[PDB]
Every structure is written in C-alpha cells, then in structure tokens.
Design a binder for this molecule. Structure first.
Ligand SMILES: Nc1nc2c(ncn2[C@@H]2O[C@H](COP(=O)(O)OP(=O)(O)OP(=O)(O)O)[C@@H](O)[C@H]2O)c(=O)[nH]1
Ligand SMILES: Nc1nc2c(ncn2[C@@H]2O[C@H](COP(=O)(O)OP(=O)(O)O)[C@@H](O)[C@H]2O)c(=O)[nH]1
Ligand SMILES: Nc1nc2c(ncn2[C@@H]2O[C@H](COP(=O)(O)OP(=O)(O)O)[C@@H](O)[C@H]2O)c(=O)[nH]1
Ligand SMILES: [Mg+2]
Lengths: 20, 139, 428, 201, 426, 22, 426
C-alpha cells in the first residue's frame, strides 16, 4: 500500500508568488 | 540524444539548456539498497535549491546501471530530473570513463564546461549539501 | 547601525517565527533563495552580491522542529548555522531546560548572537519568541534572557510570549511552567506581549469565520501584529514610532510591562465587499472586547495606556477625531492619574496579505498594544491553577529531582502575589 | 513552477517557451534560463471548452470572469451532495447584477463516456470533453488524485473528488475551495470564492 | 540522534515483538529483505530511531531477542519479516525457564545475563547517545517475568538517567493460563515499581472483548490479537519518528503523566476500532474519535474505568486534523464527564498532534491514561496471592529455589500499599 | 571462484585532470 | 627493486605455505597455469617482490621448498596452485627426521643444507638487490624445526644486514601431539633468538578458538586454519606491494616494534572476522574494527594479553579509508586501557594505511604486538622442559646423534633469562 501523508509545514509553505 | 521528461511523449533536451548551470552526474541502479534512500533526498534537494530562482541553477543527469529496460523506465517514472536513453552508447562510455564499478554506486560527480571532473562525492556510510551551485557556473 | 535582532526559542517560537519570516519575505519582496530580483537593512544582512540573510536565531533542544525548517523550502534563506539544535527535547519542564540540557547550547547561542550584534553598532532591540507554557521555550528562553541581560544591558528586549490559555492546555504542567517562568522573566525583560490561543480562536470563528483552524492560521494572524509593530522601523510614514520608546511611553512603573494586543480589520473576502472600512469603526472594532488576543475582558479592568499604529491610507486629521470619540464613550474607563493615554502612529504602507492566505487585502489597519488593570484576571487563575496543584504537591518529584529545589515554588508564588497586589495598588 | 514542477502543462509550457526564447536569441542579450514571468502560454487550446448546446468556445471569452475548475465524478456521493448547492450558487451569484461574474469549467473523472455525458447533462456551465487529453494533463497538473493509481514525483496529493479551484491567467492556481480538504467545510465553503480578485486575463 | 533499543523476552513478548517489527517496517516502507521502498522522504529522515544502517545499504532492527527455550526464536525466524534481525542478537537458552519465576531470574536466569547484557552494550555504545529502552514481555509466565525483568534491573543500574518502557501483559481476571500467575505478577510488580518508568498494561480478556463488540470478529488467532497491540505500540512512538504540528517525545509524555514516582501504570486505548460491516456507515471525525476515547468497552485494559477517576490521560492524535477541534473536544470531554475526572488537577487532558496517519487509515489516536480504576488488577491479583500463601501452597519450588519467605511478605507489602496510594488519591 | 578488482590508490583517485580556469 | 625470498620447511610450513601461494596468487591475480588475468595495472606494478618473469610471461614464485620426506611434497604439486613452483626449487629428503631435532640439525640435515642453501643463493644473488627473507616452519616438528632453524643460522652468516620474518607454530598450551615438544622447542628457541630478526607466533589452539567462536565454523579443517594464518601473513607484507597513504615495510616494523634486540616475539591478530551469515549485516567501520582488534579472542597467539602490558604494538590497515579514525581511535584505545600499555614509551601505537584492501572485503586490518604477556609460553615450555629434563627423559636420541647434556643446560639458560627480562619490564 502506498504512503500519501505529508507534514503541515511542507504541504503549506509553498513558494508563494511575489507581489507586484 | 540525451533525454528530459514529459508525460505522454518523451522530449529531448536542448544543448543550450545547460547554460549558466552546474551539472552533476548521478549514478544509480534500481533495486539497489542505497539508491532507494539516495533518490528521495536528492529529489528534495533538486526541488528546493533549484526552484526558488527565477533562473534554474543546477542540473542532474541520471545514469542507471540497471539490467533491464523496463526497470530503468519504471525508475525514470519516479526520477524528476533529466536522464539518458538506455540504448545509446553515451551511458556506457560515461560509466567506463568516470570510474564507477558495477558498492561505490550511488555517487555524484559535478563536472565543468569541458566535461572533465570538477568534484566527486560518494554516499558510503548531510553530504548532498557539500556541492555548491555557485561553483560550476558555465559561460 | 540602528537595527533589531530576533530570537526564536521553542517550537512555538519557531513556527511563529516561521510565519513571521513569511510575511517579512513577502513585504520586501525577497525571493526565497535570498536575493531580491534601505528598508531591508533593518532586518537583514548583505551577504555580498545581493544575498540577504535574516537576523534571527532559532534555538531548540527538540531537533524535530528545526530540521523540518532545515529540510523545508526556506533552507537557503538562513545562514546555515543560526539554526542550532540540540540532541533531545527539554520535555515540558522548566527545570530541564534551565539547568541540565540547557547549558551545552546556551554558550553556542550566546556566541551566535554576538557577531550578529556587532555587525553594526547602536543596535535597537531584541525580539524574543517563545511558548512560556512548555519546557524549552520557557526555561531556555530565560537563560538567553538572563545571559543577554548581563552582557548587553543598554538594549531593549521585546518578548512575544504565548501565554497559556484559561481553558485550553495541551500540556498539564503549564501551571508549573508559568510561575517558574514569571519570576525569572519579569525583572529580566523590558517589554512582553500577551497572546492567548483560544482568544485568537474566538477571533477566527467570529471575524474571519472559520470553525476549525490550525496553528498555521494562528501564527499567520499573529505575524500580522508583529510586522505592523515593527513597520515604523522598516517603512517611511507620516508619524512613526520605534521600538526604543516603549519604556518611554508604555511602562508606568518598572515592573509592570505586560501588554495585551489587538488587531483590526480581520476580515475575509467574504465581508470585505459587504463592508467599507472607515477609521470610525476600525478604531471601534479595535477596542471591542471580543477582539483582543488574550481572553481578557476589560469591563472589569481600567485602561492605562494605548499605542495605535495606523497603517495604510490614513489621514491624521480623522485620527484625532476618531480617538476623541472613544474618550467620550463611557463604557471604557481610563485610570484617574493618567489624563492622556493614546499614542498615535501612521505608516504609509498598506498591510500585505500572503498568497493563498485567509485575510483580505484591507486598505488601512490598526495594531493596538495596551496596558490595562484587567491583567489581574490573567495572573489570578494561573495563580489559582498553581496553588491547587501544589496544595498537596503533585508533579514535584521531577522538579526536585532535576535541580529546582523546594522554595522556588514558594518564592515565585509570593513573587506573583506581589505582582497581583501591585496591579490593584495602581487602580485605586 | 506553479502549481507543481512535475506537471505536464508546466513542462510543455517551458519547453515551448524555451524553444521560442532560443529562436529569438538565434534570430537576434536575453536571459537563460528565463524568469517565470517571461513564460507565457495559451492555457486552453481551441477545441476544449464547450457549453450547453455543445458549441466550442475560444479561451478569449473568459476575460473578466472568475473561473473555477470543478473536478467531479458521477458515482461519488460527495459530488452528488455538492452539485445542487453549487448550482444554486451559480444561479444566484451570477444573475445578481449586470455582468457574468463567475464561470465554471467541468472536468470529469467519470468511468466512461456514458457517465460523462449523463453527469454533464445536469450542469449549465462549461465543460471539457473526456476524449481530449487536456483532462488528464489538467488533473495531474493540479495533482487532483482520485485513488493512488498514478505515481507522483514526491508531491503530496492536495485533494480529490469533488474539488473546486479558482484559476489565474498564467495557469497559477489561486485557491482550492475547502470542500474536501484539511478545513473540510462541505457545501458552505463555496462562498469563499473571491470573484473580485480572481479575474482571468 | 535518539534511538530506542528494543528487548523481546519471554514466550509472549517474542510473539508480540514479532508483530511489532512487522507493522513498523511496512509503514516505514522497508522490505523483509531490509531494503527500502516507497520514495517518501518523511518515512526516511527519521529511520534511525529503530534501525541501524548495515554498510550494504540495508537496515537491521535494533531489537535483542532473548529467551531460555530455543523454540520461539526459531519460530520468529521462520515467520515473515523474520530475516531482519541479526543472528548475533539472538541469545537462546536450552533449559527452559519452566514457568518458575525464580529459575527464570536466578537459576538459569543468571547464565544468559552475561551474553544478553554484552550484546545490548554493543548496541548501546556504538550510537550517538540513546534515549530509551522499550521491552516487550509478560507478567504471567516465567521467562518473561524473570529473565527480562532481571534485564530491567541490570540495565537500569547501568544507565540510571535514561528512560525505559515496558509493554507488559497481565494475568486475566476471568480465566488464567500458567496457574502460578499470582506468584508471578506479585513478584514482578515489586521489581517494576522500583526499576520501571512506565508500564503500559495489556490484558488478554479485554482484548477478546474488543474482538467481541467493536470489531465483530469471529475467529481471532494470535495474529490479530498481537496486531492490535502493536497498533498501540506504534502510536506511542509515532510522534518521535515523524514531524507534526505539536511534537511530543517519550520522555515528554512521562513528564506530564506520572504525578508521583510510584504510580506509573497505564491503560491503553486505540481508535478507530470498526467492524467491517459498519466501516462504510461511519463518520471519522475528531469529535467522533474522542467518544471512542472514553469508551469503557474500548480500553486495552481489563478494568472498568467508570468506577474511578482518571488522574492524568494523554492522547496522541495522528493525521491532518484541525487544532481547535482537538482541544475543544478535550474540554468537551472534560466538562460533561466532570464526575469522571479528578478535581484537584485542572485541565487533566494532554493532547499531541503528529502529521502522519498510520497505513491504510486517514485519522487515528492512541490513548495512554492513568486511572485510579487500575487498582482492580492490583486488588484481584492481590487477594489471589494472599489466598494461596495463607495455606502456603506451591511455594516449595520458590523456597526450594532461593527466594525465602521474607521477600514474599515484602512483595505483597509493596503491591497492597500501591493499592493504598491509589485509594489515597481519590 | 574468481573475484574482480575494484579498488584504486588515493593519488590516482583524486589527482585527475581538473578544469582550467577562464 | 625489492624482493622477498620465501623459504618453506616441514609439513606444517608447506601446508601453510601452500596457502600463501593461494592468497597472494589471487590478490595479484596470477593464473595457476602461469599467466595473468584481472586486467589492472596496480597488481602488475609491484610483482617482482614475490614473483619472477620466465621469458614466456609466466610468473614462477621465488619460493624455496625443503622437507625431509616426500609425502608433503606430493601434496603441494598435486593440488590447486601446484604447477606454479619450479621443480628445481623442490629439494627432497628421503629418510625423514622422525621428530628428532638432533637429526634435523646435525645428522640428516647436514648433507642437505649444502644443497638447499645452493638454491637460495641462485634466487638471492640472482636479483639486483634484496630486502629480506621470510620463513615458515614449526617448533614441535623435526624436519621443520631442525632444518629450518639450521637454515636461519647458515643464511645469517652470508646476509647479516637483511631482515628475517618467520612464523613458527609453537607447542599447544593445553594438549599437544609429538611428545618431544620441549626438546624440539627449547632447543630451537635459543638459536632462534640469536638469528631471527622478527618472529611472530601462531598457536593451533589459538586458531581453534578463533574459527569456532568468531568464524562459527562447526567443522574447521587445516585447509581453513592455514587460510586464516595465511590471510594475516599477506597483511604484514602487503604495504610493500600496494601504494598507500602511510607506507610501511617490514623494516619499518622492525625498527619500531623491537626496543631491545632480545625481545622480538610478536603476537598476530586479524579483523574483520564474522561468519558467513554476518557479512550482510555488520557495519564495516574503523571504530568497530579497532574494537575487534584489541580482543584476546582475535589473537592468533594462545595467550591473554590483559595479564601483561603491550610494550609496543602496531596495526596495518588496508583500504580506502579516512585517516582521522585511524589516528584518533589509536589515541582512544591508548587512553582508555591505561594499565594495558607500558608507561615509559608513551603513544605506543604505530599505524600504517595502505590503499588497496584484500579481495572480498573493503577495509581490513592486520595487528602485531610485542607483549610481555608472552611470558606464559616461555614459562610453560620451560617448566615442561624443566620437569622432563630433571630425570633425563628421552635424551638418548639427541645424545645418540652427537649432542651433549651441556647444550641442554644452555638452551634452558638462554631461554630462562628471556622469561626474566620480560618480567623486568612489567
Ligand atoms: N500560537 C501558537 N502557539 C503554539 C504553537 N505551537 C505550540 N504552541 C503553544 O506551545 C505550547 C506548548 O509548548 P511548546 O511550544 O509546544 O513546547 P516548548 O514550549 O518549546 O517546550 P518543550 O516541551 O520542551 O518543547 C502549547 O500550549 C501551545 O499553546 C503555534 O504554532 N502557534
Ligand atoms: N497477547 C498475547 N498473550 C500471549 C501470547 N502468547 C502467550 N501469551 C500470554 O502469556 C501468558 C503466559 O506467559 P508466557 O509467555 O506463556 O510464559 P513465558 O514462557 O514465561 O514467557 C499467558 O497468560 C498468555 O495469555 C500472544 O501471542 N499474545
Ligand atoms: N596450523 C597447522 N599446524 C600443523 C599442520 N600440520 C601439522 N601441524 C602442526 O605441526 C606439528 C608437528 O610438526 P610438523 O611440522 O608436522 O613436523 P615436520 O613437518 O616433520 O617438521 C603438530 O603439533 C601440528 O600441530 C597444519 O596443516 N596446520
Ligand atoms: Mg520543544
């Protein structure tokens, strides 16, 4: 069976786009 | 002649793709015990280090010592960086050049614009970070 | 020259700091490699060709929160050795982090902060970040407070301590981990802000309208208060107020430097469309008792001081009218000896909203830091939690066995009892 | 690099735009590799979007509206719960006023063409036919996985069926509406949509 | 880093521990051949909590298998996931501690202490610096309660400051096996109160009651009984191995659960436990999991928790759940069950959120709590021991072995005073 | 049974042709 | 360049010496038909140290093979690696010294030493410039301890400045065959200590312990036992052959490990040594290597070195390997085990690193040590010689071939002071 669980920090703090 | 990924059809990479980046050769063979834990850490390092810059700064060339085309394909299906075709002779020349026996594998060699060896790091035992992308800028 | 230094200790302080250095990156538009594509100078350091490295140190003996920062996407933002991480967690004990497992990394952290501090000369302040309810934030953060106190004594030290909730615990030793922190943090830090987790829970159920949030939604909305406080250090404004003037304007008597916090507006894209945000109500929602951050109902308290940093498109001539409305209002009672208790600040920068967040792009906002005589209820129940737990001596045997002897339980309790009776001495 | 690098839309966009940049450099100082704002892509090809009455409409029609992809399955009980609320939201939110504010692109994970057409007949917004591969590229591009049947390149599955997500002009995902997610606000988070800000261009 | 060193002793403990490394290796993604599979960095970055790398790229568990009868070690090897252990770590015996607590502890108990302490020392000193010692054993049998419990006392004098935990099964209330259990459990409780940090009790007749109702299973062998105990085993060390929103360690659970140095026995519970029929018709939500939290028919323990007040209980939640719905539900379960908690401690609940659910499920929680109703087995075994000893039965194979009657009178004086302190605090 | 040779000296392993500077 | 001449004597030497021409054969990859396969330079670079070109490309060993009976000579050229040796270097004896040292050194060896020493001159003087000679023999035997020890005396008289490195298997400590052990050991030691530059001792009861406890082989053959001692006997001369980081030779070892010219009887060990099923499991590291190396169970000398002090010691490591853990662990052992090392030579340890490890492994070590716990042999052989001489047991064969009782007094006295002058430095 596969594993499909990620932590809060990794799955949230994605590299957000910079504001104009 | 050397292959990057795309889902649905396989697209070859440009020779000018490697401009201004640092190219590390990565040796692996599937089913090997150490390769299964060297793949995910260098995957995460690829993602994090190379995808904050608007310009990508590193590139990793995958070379497989596998015994089967289907096994190489199913591990390419997990590999997110670039690789090379199995039937081509460049893989054989590269493994017979850079001194890799068929427990030294897995290992990494950062190279330069001339293609000659610029740095060697193995994994026989936090050592992925010893390579710096600022070292091998290419013109 | 005149810049500020930030210390994050304990995994609450790391994650609060983690969100704090989200908004700081997005405000100045630095790219998470470390280089943008002199306002940045007040928090960063030019590491040569455009690279910025922040002036923050992360300190935890629990290696499982620093490593996930190390492995996270902000790995090259920080210079690789301000993130110093021990071997094993202090485990919710004041005694463990202050005595046994503290000292082997305090010397590394003291030596860490030194070369950062003397990168320039005339540095302004210190920014603590810790959970005072747990072990390695409270006890260890004390040590970094007391050791910095003797070295750098002419410097202000700001603390942002997540005070433990009245009803919510998530750790049963928090009554013990508070009183053993309050004595050893009172007379050693200059300025500290109460923040409570269920109060900001009641913020996000009512205003932003989410029923079941996460700590990441707590810290992101705590980070808005943090950036708005230090906004005058960063950005030019009509009337700006810095860190160095909080003993000057907020501290009446030397011991009393515990302050609440508030923020407005805190609204979604839900009702941003349905409501205009004029300065009449954002100063009315700021003082509204269900909009602080620390549960503290100020109806049974008396105000003493207030500092408002309006930010965004605010003209000053309606600031004066808006604060005049509050003084005429009768439900809020300032103390008799303090005739004027409003400090006004105006910055020119609108607050920034993180992409994929949950706050709306408001035009103008207010961050409020207040002294009230209503903190009596805040220190009363955590006195009331301590004296029942110790009434016939629960949990003492790991405190005594670790190094804190009997008597610091006693002497801190009348130390708190001194602090409670001082507040009642003020208000009469 | 938005949303995920291991995604066919991003990789084909950067292949085509790197080819265009190399052709421009060969014809004519330009930066290699180009910045993310430098890549531009026609996200939706010609024969992709069809409305009710089955008329194919170009991408240029979507200007000035808040557009959301809706990934849905015919057999899913949560989808059957979600659809009426979303119909009423479309109805009210879009007849109120003078402009067509919101607009919805339906992508099916259905188990054949019969299920796709039957579930499509219930809906008034746009749709993408299942035969065109853009469905498969889109679902992996947004990593919306039904069950673990397609391997990932280390990226975790954000959400599955049903899912609503609002779109930007450069293919950047704006936000997942929290229907089946960590928040899990079913049939009530549809009104978290930010139609003033999310404007396709 | 911190690594837990495992000890598997006794007939019971070797079977439970066999299922332990069965369930840890496949949620961590390691094949029985020792190689890794899965390509998930979180499953890998803390693998050294239980594994040691073997310079072939393969792993080896840090478990020491120790017994005095050679059959069960060959049973573990013959089972699946049995090639993981190192053959040098196997320390057999040949006499067989014939369910006589004295002879598992002295007679042929002493002659393997040299070999079993030598192999755990080799494991202990080669690492960074260790954290704790989990052992799996039984308090009913002889070699589980003699041979491993002497391994308790020899290790704890060797490392005095490090933590160690025991997952020990107990004599059943209704029907016992190994008819000298009252002598075994009472002689093993007064080594555990002196030399053990937390003793997580499992009771066999309650485990069948779990298979009675909450699973509606028909024919449960010793496969799925041990498989559900291993679920509770993995839950208490889940939060060390993986990150989360609120991380908690084994020592931090011990800081806030044991209020006084003696009473450190723990009732365990696992949720969800669903029958396969009702698996479709069930909402798996944080306010729903917290109701199987305080279900008297859900605890692994045999005692009835409704006849006493919990002194301190902890809950290791696993999964991506909202923090508010957690701590409000802990306050929800505290306010309405106000009569079922003790009053002289405010806010008794402890909660800890990790970010990794176990394999095949979306959300889980492991309950580790301290009840004053655990006094029942300390009372029911007690009047079992005082009954037999009053007519001096069976003691001639103890008195004939080295333990005379001073320690037996001492052993009951230990455990009945433990009943007194539990009643003192209620 | 025979066994292949798979080792090298330190100087020959590291003092290789090296990249010339620009 | 440098060459080592390898001279074999007796049945025991010749069975051991067959394995040297097996383990050096495949390390250098020479084919027993004569040629080379293995297609790498670094074996072929330094091969004149043990082989000779033969104008057909084949490599004849520079080995001198003497014995007084042809039965062992039949066993050499018939087995594997048997066609390698030159027949002219096979020198025979017909009669056989029936385990009598007198006819080994005076009666039968007298008319053969003139022939075997002629063959040594052709190999020795036939080169450019020689380094040393090495000898393998016994001390219990007659044809090995007689003609062997006669050869050392007569070859020092021609080459006094070259080095001697000899294995000699001593009499067994507990139970030994060939009842004239002390008349063959004591009468050969007192001429060994005046003619041999370095001798390092091997005990068949020592290899019994190693192959049973460590190798875990239930059926140890002399074919296995000689292979183990031949494994070390490559390792003491390996760093001549392969390039390395801290190069050492035998003269390197000889100037450094022998303080005074009396005491030069060394001890031999070897690591790694794990059974067939443990090559998959152990983590091959230098820190575990040095723990295996300072154990009495590793030692090929049937003695307890912890009863005395290591006066000087040296470890020759092989393999691609970091030099900190070489240096810092030799520091660590010298600072932990204080009383196990002599005081007035501080930092007793010589370390040498050669880059190319033996085949099969990746890191290996060969350990030598001059210890003052070697008293236990010289005392055991003396008092056995003392008790068996006080009433003239079995003298009349030694006196029968031309000795006297006066050579037996001096052979006791020359080895009696050797017992005291180790005791002087303890
Ligand atoms: N606002 C906020 N509070 C947090 C967060 N994480 C933990 N806390 C608080 O931290 C308290 C417990 O202390 P922790 O920070 O978890 O641990 P610690 O204070 O560092 O001490 P240790 O137990 O040694 O780790 C809880 O009561 C929470 O209220 C967070 O992300 N945001
Ligand atoms: N839960 C569980 N208990 C067991 C198992 N095997 C034996 N036991 C229990 O072990 C107790 C007796 O101890 P035992 O292990 O047989 O004696 P030992 O030989 O001294 O270790 C009995 O009460 C059994 O209930 C098992 O597989 N699972
Ligand atoms: N290690 C080892 N010792 C042996 C072997 N063969 C004989 N010996 C020993 O040799 C001793 C007898 O001396 P030996 O060398 O055989 O007499 P010689 O050959 O006629 O000089 C006995 O004590 C044996 O222990 C062998 O193959 N290996
Ligand atoms: Mg912590």
């Amino acid at each position: 069976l596969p594993f499909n669980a990620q932590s809060c920090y990794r799955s949230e703090y994605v590299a957000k786009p910079l504001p104009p | 002649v050397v292959k990057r990924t795309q889902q649905g059809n396989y697209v070859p990479v440009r020779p000018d793709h490697f401009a201004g980046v640092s190219v590390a050769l990565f040796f692996a063979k599937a089913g090997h015990s150490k390769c299964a834990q060297i793949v995910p850490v260098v995957r995460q390092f690829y993602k994090t280090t190379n995808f904050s810059g608007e310009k990508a700064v590193i590139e990793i060339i995958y070379v497989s010592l596998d015994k089967d085309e289907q096994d190489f394909e199913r591990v390419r299906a997990l590999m997110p960086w670039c690789s090379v075709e199995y039937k081509s002779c460049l893989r054989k020349k590269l493994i017979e050049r850079y001194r890799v026996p068929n427990t030294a594998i897995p290992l990494l060699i950062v190279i330069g614009p001339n293609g000659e060896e610029a740095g060697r790091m193995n994994f026989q035992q936090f050592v992925l970070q010893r390579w710096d992308y600022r070292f091998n800028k290419w013109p | 020259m005149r810049e500020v230094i930030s210390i994050h200790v304990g995994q609450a302080g790391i994650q609060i700091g983690n969100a704090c250095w989200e908004l700081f990156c997005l405000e100045h538009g630095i790219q998470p490699d470390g280089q943008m594509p002199d306002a940045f100078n007040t928090f960063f350091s030019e590491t040569g060709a455009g690279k910025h490295v922040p002036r923050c140190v992360f300190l935890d003996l629990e290696p499982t929160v620093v490593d996930e920062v190390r492995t996270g996407t902000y790995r090259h933002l920080f210079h690789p050795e301000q993130l110093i991480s021990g071997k094993e967690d202090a485990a919710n004990n004041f005694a463990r982090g202050h005595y046994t497992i503290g000292k082997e990394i305090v010397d590394l952290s003291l030596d860490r902060i030194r070369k950062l501090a003397d990168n320039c000369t005339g540095l302004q302040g210190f920014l603590m970040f810790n959970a005072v309810g747990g072990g390695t934030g409270s006890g260890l953060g004390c040590l970094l407070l007391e050791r910095l106190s003797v070295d750098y004594g002419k410097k202000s030290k700001l603390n942002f301590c997540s005070w433990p909730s009245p009803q919510v615990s998530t750790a049963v030793v928090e009554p013990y981990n508070s009183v053993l922190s309050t004595h050893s943090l009172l007379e050693h830090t200059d300025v500290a802000v109460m923040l409570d987790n269920e109060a900001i829970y009641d913020i996000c159920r009512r205003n932003l309208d989410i029923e079941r949030p996460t700590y990441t939604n707590l810290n992101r909305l705590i980070a808005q208060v943090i950036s708005s406080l230090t906004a005058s250090l960063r950005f030019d404004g009509a009337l700006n107020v810095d860190v160095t003037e909080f003993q000057t304007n907020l501290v009446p008597y030397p011991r009393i430097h515990f302050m609440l916090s508030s923020y407005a507006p805190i609204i979604s894209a839900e009702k941003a469309y349905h409501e205009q945000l004029s300065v009449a109500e954002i100063t009315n929602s700021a003082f509204e008792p269900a909009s602080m951050m620390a549960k503290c109902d100020p109806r049974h308290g008396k105000y003493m001081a207030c500092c408002l940093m309006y930010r965004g498109d605010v003209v000053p001539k309606d600031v004066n009218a808006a604060v005049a409305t509050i003084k005429t209002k009768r439900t809020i009672q300032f103390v008799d000896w303090c005739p004027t208790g409003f400090k006004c600040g105006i910055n020119y920068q609108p607050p920034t909203v993180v992409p994929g967040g949950d706050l709306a792009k408001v035009m103008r906002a207010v961050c409020m830091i207040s002294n009230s005589t209503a903190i009596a209820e805040v220190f009363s129940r955590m006195d009331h939690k301590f004296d029942l737990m110790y009434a016939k001596r629960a949990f003492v045997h790991w405190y005594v066995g670790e190094g804190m002897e009997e008597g610091e339980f006693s002497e801190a309790r009348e130390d708190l009892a001194a602090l409670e009776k001082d507040y009642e001495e003020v208000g009469i | 690099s938005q949303p995920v690098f291991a995604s066919p839309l991003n990789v084909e966009k950067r292949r085509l735009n790197e080819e265009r940049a190399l052709m421009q450099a060969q014809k004519a100082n330009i930066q290699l590799p180009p910045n993310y704002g430098d890549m531009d892509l026609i996200l939706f090809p010609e024969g992709s979007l069809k409305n009710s009455n089955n008329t194919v409409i170009p991408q240029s029609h979507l200007k000035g509206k808040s557009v959301a992809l809706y990934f849905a399955d015919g057999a899913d009980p949560k989808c059957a719960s979600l659809l009426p609320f979303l119909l009423n939201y479309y109805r009210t939110m879009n007849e109120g006023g003078a402009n067509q504010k919101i607009e919805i692109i339906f992508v099916s994970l259905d188990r054949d063409r019969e299920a796709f057409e039957s579930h499509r007949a219930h809906m008034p917004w746009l749709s993408i036919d299942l035969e065109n591969p853009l469905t498969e590229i889109l679902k992996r591009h947004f990593r919306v996985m039904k069950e673990y049947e397609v391997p990932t390149y280390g990226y975790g599955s954000r959400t599955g069926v049903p899912s609503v997500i609002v779109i930007g002009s450069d293919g950047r995902e704006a936000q997942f509406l929290p229907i089946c997610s960590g928040l899990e606000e079913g049939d009530r988070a549809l009104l978290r949509w930010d139609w003033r800000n999310t404007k396709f261009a | 880093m911190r690594e837990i060193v495992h000890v598997q002793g006794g007939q019971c403990g070797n079977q439970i521990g066999a299922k332990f490394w069965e369930v840890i290796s496949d949620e961590h993604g390691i094949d029985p051949t020792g190689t890794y599979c899965g390509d998930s960095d979180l499953q890998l970055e803390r693998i050294n909590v239980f594994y040691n790398e073997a310079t072939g790229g393969r792993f080896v568990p840090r478990a020491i298998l120790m017994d005095l009868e050679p059959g069960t070690m060959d049973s573990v090897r013959a089972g699946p996931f049995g090639q993981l252990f190192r053959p040098d770590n196997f320390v057999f015996g040949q006499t067989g501690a014939g369910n006589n607590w004295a002879k598992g502890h002295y007679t042929e108990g002493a002659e393997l202490i040299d070999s079993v302490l030598d192999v755990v020392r080799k494991e202990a000193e080669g690492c960074d610096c260790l954290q704790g010692f989990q052992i799996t054993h039984s308090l009913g049998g002889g070699t589980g309660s003699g041979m491993g419990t002497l391994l308790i006392s020899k290790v704890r004098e060797e490392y005095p400051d490090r933590i160690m935990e025991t997952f020990s099964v107990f004599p059943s209330p209704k029907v016992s096996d190994t008819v000298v259990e009252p002598y075994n459990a009472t002689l093993s409780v007064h080594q555990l109160v002196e030399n053990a940090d937390e003793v997580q009790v499992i009771d066999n007749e309650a485990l069948y009651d779990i298979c009675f109702r909450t699973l509606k299973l028909t024919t449960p062998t010793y496969g799925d009984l041990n498989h559900l105990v291993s679920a509770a085993m993995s839950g208490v060390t889940c939060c060390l191995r993986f990150p989360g929103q609120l991380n908690s360690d084994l020592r931090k659970l011990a800081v806030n659960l044991i209020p006084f140095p003696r009473l450190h026995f723990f009732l365990i519970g696992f949720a969800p436990l669903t029958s396969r029929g009702s698996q479709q018709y069930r909402a798996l939500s944080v306010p729903e999991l917290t109701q199987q939290m305080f279900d008297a028919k859900n605890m692994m323990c045999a005692s009835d928790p409704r006849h006493g007040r919990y002194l301190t209980a902890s809950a290791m939640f696993r999964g991506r759940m909202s923090t508010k719905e957690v701590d409000e539900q802990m306050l929800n379960v505290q306010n309405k069950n106000s009569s079922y908690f003790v009053e002289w401690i405010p806010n008794n609940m402890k909660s800890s959120v990790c970010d990794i659910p176990p394999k095949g499920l979306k959300m889980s929680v492991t309950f580790v709590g301290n009840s004053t109703a655990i006094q029942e087995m300390f009372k029911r075994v007690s009047d079992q021991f005082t009954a037999m000893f009053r007519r001096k039965a069976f003691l001639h194979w103890y008195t004939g072995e080295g333990m005379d009657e001073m320690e037996f009178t001492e052993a009951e004086s230990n455990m009945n005073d433990l009943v007194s302190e539990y009643q003192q605090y209620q």
